[PDB]
Paper text:
The replacement of the methyl-ester with an amide group results in a pronounced reduction on WT binding affinities. Co-crystal structures confirm the formation of the expected hydrogen bond to Asn140. As this hydrogen bond locks the bump in an orientation facing the WT leucine residue it exacerbates the steric clash. Methyl, ethyl and allyl bumps, the 9′ methoxy group and the ethyl-amide side-group typically met our criteria.
These four human proteins – BRD2, BRD3, BRD4 and BRDT – each contain two tandem bromodomains that bind acetylated lysine residues in histone tails, leading to the recruitment of multi-protein complexes to chromatin. The phenotypes generated by said inhibitors have been used to investigate the functions of BET proteins and their significance as therapeutic targets. This process has been limited by the pan-selective nature of the BET inhibitors, as they typically target all BET bromodomains with similar potency, hence specific proteins/bromodomains cannot be associated to specific phenotypes. Through structural analysis of the bromodomain we hypothesized that a leucine/valine substitution (L/V) would be a more conservative change than the previous L/A substitution, resulting in a smaller ‘hole’ but still allowing enough space to accommodate a bumped ligand.
Numbering used by the authors: 346 to 455
Write the structure that this text describes.
Amino acid sequence: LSEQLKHCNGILKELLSKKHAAYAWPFYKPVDASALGVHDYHDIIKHPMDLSTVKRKMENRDYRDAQEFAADVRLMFSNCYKYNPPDHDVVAMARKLQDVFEFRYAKMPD
Ligand SMILES: C=CC[C@@H](C(=O)NCC)[C@@H]1N=C(c2ccc(Cl)cc2)c2cc(OC)ccc2-n2c(C)nnc21
């Protein structure tokens, strides 16, 4: 990995760690629309994303730069905001986790 992508991998480890598990767990695996009963999810969200998919792409060295990594993580959060009403518990959780991501991502090295 490039030096910037190592920082990205370190953020990803933190997002999956026990410290943040109370609000991060909804984002661990892909949305199973049938299991959750949200039969309109794939009509509204055209590009699903989740942390296990980000992790698999990083493992296979599939990100070209830090920007591609950030776009996926932000996609994951934007899907959550797009589908759900603003006062929903899961949107608060997404908020909370995204503040962890954005704060540490802003500390990128040269
Ligand atoms: C995709 C389904 C929509 C949400 C839902 O279940 N109900 C609202 C109509 C759902 N809520 C949640 C959710 C709702 C309440 C609380 Cl406290 C935590 C998560 C959700 C749950 C999961 O369990 C394995 C996985 C993905 C979730 N998720 C994401 C991500 N964005 N919305 C959700």
